[PDB]
Amino acid sequence: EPLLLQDRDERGVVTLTLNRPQAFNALSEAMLAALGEAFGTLAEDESVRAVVLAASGKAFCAGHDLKEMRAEPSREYYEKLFARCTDVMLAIQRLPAPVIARVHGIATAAGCQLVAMCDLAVATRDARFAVSGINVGLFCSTPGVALSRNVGRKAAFEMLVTGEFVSADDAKGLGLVNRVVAPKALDDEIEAMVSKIVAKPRAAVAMGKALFYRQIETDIESAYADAGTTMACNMMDPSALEGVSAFLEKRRPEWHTPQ
Amino acid sequence: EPLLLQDRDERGVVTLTLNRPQAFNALSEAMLAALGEAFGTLAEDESVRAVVLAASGKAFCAGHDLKEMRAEPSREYYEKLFARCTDVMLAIQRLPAPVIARVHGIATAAGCQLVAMCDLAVATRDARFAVSGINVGLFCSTPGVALSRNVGRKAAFEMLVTGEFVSADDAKGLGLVNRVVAPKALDDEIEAMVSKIVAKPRAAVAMGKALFYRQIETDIESAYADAGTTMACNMMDPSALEGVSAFLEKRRPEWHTPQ
Amino acid sequence: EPLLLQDRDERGVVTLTLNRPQAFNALSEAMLAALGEAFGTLAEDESVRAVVLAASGKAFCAGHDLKEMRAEPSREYYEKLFARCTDVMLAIQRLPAPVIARVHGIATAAGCQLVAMCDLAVATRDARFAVSGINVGLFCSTPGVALSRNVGRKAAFEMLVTGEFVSADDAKGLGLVNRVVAPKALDDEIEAMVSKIVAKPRAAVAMGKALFYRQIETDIESAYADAGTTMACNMMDPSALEGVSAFLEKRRPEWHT
Fold it and tell me: Which family does it belong to (chain C) (predicted)?
């Protein structure tokens, strides 16, 4: 039974499902290796249009595997383990397709980090979020990096030092997720978001996501120089040329994308 | 009829009105040139106290002029066009008076960018905001620069990749506008904001706006060094000396500003 | 009475109380010197677990002392005064224990800056917040540094150019405070927060706060490099090894907290 399931539809939409349900999908070394391999392969495939990051069992993800970690009390071990995790997280952010977290239960510590690194997230009303490493004496330093780029400073600091859960409604308000729905509506809500993305041209979405994360962490003038260069290249893409033509000619664009 | 109307009251409040109502005030080359010249002229006039950026017809601004843009495509043409737009946007942010967007209808793509670049914005409840370039196959890279400096990452990414409208009240929640009112109340709401700004000394407002955007882009220690120097300079301005004396003597400050 | 009261409980929780109640706790030169001295001494003491920044009288803090400032104006004096304020504000953010603002009344100008510089804040439902220097012709340039790192750009700009008050509930929504409660519930809400912090290992909280503010101001890859090595160091601390073992053995950790 694989630690990470992988399914693909006829639209280029890939679902990766964390699959250690009894372990609450904890990010063991082997889980991390599977995620790294999957995102590494998907990054080379221009036909991939979106990834849904889902999870088995009651939890979304409990974070690092504490059993496995505690068995290896070595500074070098932890240095490289955390670097490996960071490599998976940056691979999510570098994938040239949007990655959507499907959060149906608890997301704690590196599990909450996963949600914060995904480009988009849809949660159920009963899902709960925490950076709760501190409850075991391990401040959530790496999850805090991702969290403090989705929520305000005081909200992040409070979460980090107390380790307490935040509701899905509150997480949406804070900026950690995009949508909150009933459990029965979760698949429909994910599909609504996927269908909107896949209807757009791949080139535009890929160029745009890459530019988004380059520009967001620089000064506004540098950001605009990159953005303008990018948007000029995007406009010379055939789907932009066709998309603008179709608008002017009051018709649907012939993008050959799933509708 | 001029592409851009310009009116000024006796308080030093300038209203610039986008005036291509049937084209939904699209930012053609000529509209951009007109905006560039207006902001250029205003930047040299220390008597200007505030600018209201308004718009004619049913829309606020549809963004770039797609008919014009599409006619003769080349990488160089788009690079230059987008740089010219960026120059207008940065001129708004660098103007030594606050610029308030008056948004009474749709603001899409570079039209949403304009709102995001203005220091302040008041919208009507029926105004809608989108970064909808993606709907014509052109990811909103340049509007995304501005948008991602007003709203959270996940909210910005969702807007950019889907191109969907956000309501005025949703936009206020997110940080893209300051105030949302009924259509009949828009002028009154603008006036309340303008009246508060013009009552304050020009010097303090000018020094303060400039510092605001320098400091927000650097580290907190560097920010404080610049802010302290700026505030010390401001304190030596006659209106600061008088405003503080007035507080201490329990009277109104003699600033000779509109009341 | 002293300008700044300082009390400490048996848990290493230190309460600093601004104590110029009739002057609305304004940050005179002497007040700033007292704050600087207290944060300097506290930074050297690894037994301190948390600091509550409280205030006497009706107001939290009105900001700089306008009477004192106005007396002998010079550019050089204002630059030095504002740099002394900044040194206190940065001392707060660099202290190896969380600093919680207990806001029971108005916080204006450098007083609102104080709130924004504290790691956490609990306000009463009638506390009000403004960056109101502009009402005396002095744009809140230094308060805006702190405010713009707690609230959105347009919200911050509007506060700065108009000088108007924002309610406690609105401040919470914006990100300027964590919790809003009735005045009678304030002490209980502060204690709820402090007790959560004290329950965690000091080492972890100290290294975590330091990492938090280093990483927040850099790019995501630099942030992760620093966070990874910091977290690896934390995991070798005996309290992390014990905290994890305790979770695994379904028992409370023996942290002597």
Answer: Belongs to the enoyl-CoA hydratase/isomerase family.
Do residue B111 and residue B173 come from a single domain? yes
Q: Where are the alpha helices (DSSP H) in chain A?
A: 29-42, 66-70, 75-94, 110-117, 141-147, 153-162, 168-174, 186-199, 202-215, 220-235, 238-248
Residue B144 three-state SS: helix
Residue B118 to chain C, least CA–CA distance (Å): 9
Residues 202-221 of C with CB under 8 A from A: 204-205, 207-209, 211-212, 215-216, 219-221
C-beta separation of A162 from C185 below 8 A: no
Rounded distance between C-alpha atoms, residue A36 and residue C251, angstroms: 34
Alpha carbon distance B78, B231 (integer Å): 41
Specify the DSSP class assigned to residue B61. Answer: B
Which conformational region is residue B12 in: left (phi greater than 0), alpha (psi within -120 to 50 degrees), or beta? left
Number of structural domains chain B divides into: 2
Alpha-carbon gap, residue A216 to C34, rounded angstroms: 40
Residue C153, chain B, CB below 8 Å: the answer is yes
| Share in percent of chain B as helix, strand, coil (round to 5) | 55, 15, 30
Residue C163 has which token pair? 């000088």
C87, C149, C150, C154, best to mutate vs chain B, most B CBs in 10 Å? C154
Which chain B residues have a beta carbon less than 8 Å from that of A207?
A: 139, 141
User: CA C146: distance to chain centroid?
Assistant: 10
Mutate to test the interface with A, among C220, C254, C257 (most CBs of A within 10 A): C220
Residues paired with residue A82 on neighbouring β-strands, in sequence order? none
CA distance C129 to B208: 19
Same domain assignment for residues B158 and B228: no
Record the resolution, in angstroms: 1.5
Q: Are residues C116 and C187 in the same domain?
A: yes
In this structure, the answer to whether residues B218 and B144 fall within a common structural domain is no
Structural determination approach? X-ray
Contacts 24+ apart (CB under 8 A), B108-111: B108/B61, B108/B62, B108/B63, B108/B132, B109/B62, B109/B63, B109/B64, B109/B133, B109/B140, B109/B143, B110/B27, B110/B61, B110/B63, B110/B64, B110/B85, B110/B142, B110/B143, B111/B25, B111/B27, B111/B59, B111/B60, B111/B61, B111/B62, B111/B63
- CA dist B31 and A136 (Å) reads 60
What is the signed CA dihedral for B44, B45, B50, B52, rounded to 10 degrees? Answer: -70
Strand order in the sheet with B50-55: B4-8, B13-18, B50-55, B99-103, B120-124, B179-181
CATH number for the domain including A53? 3.90.226.10
Per the DSSP assignment, residues forming a β-bridge with A53 are: A16, A101
Best CA proximity match to B180, nearest among B170, B168, B197: B168
| Residue C256, SS3 per DSSP | coil
Looking at the complex, report in whole angstroms how far the Cα of residue C229 sits from the nearest Cα belonging to chain A.
6
Fill in the DSSP letter of residue C118: S
Q: How would you classify the pairing of strands C128-130 and C166-167?
A: antiparallel
* Residues C214 and C175 both lie in one domain: no
- Hey, is the C-beta of B62 within 8 angstroms of any chain A C-beta? no
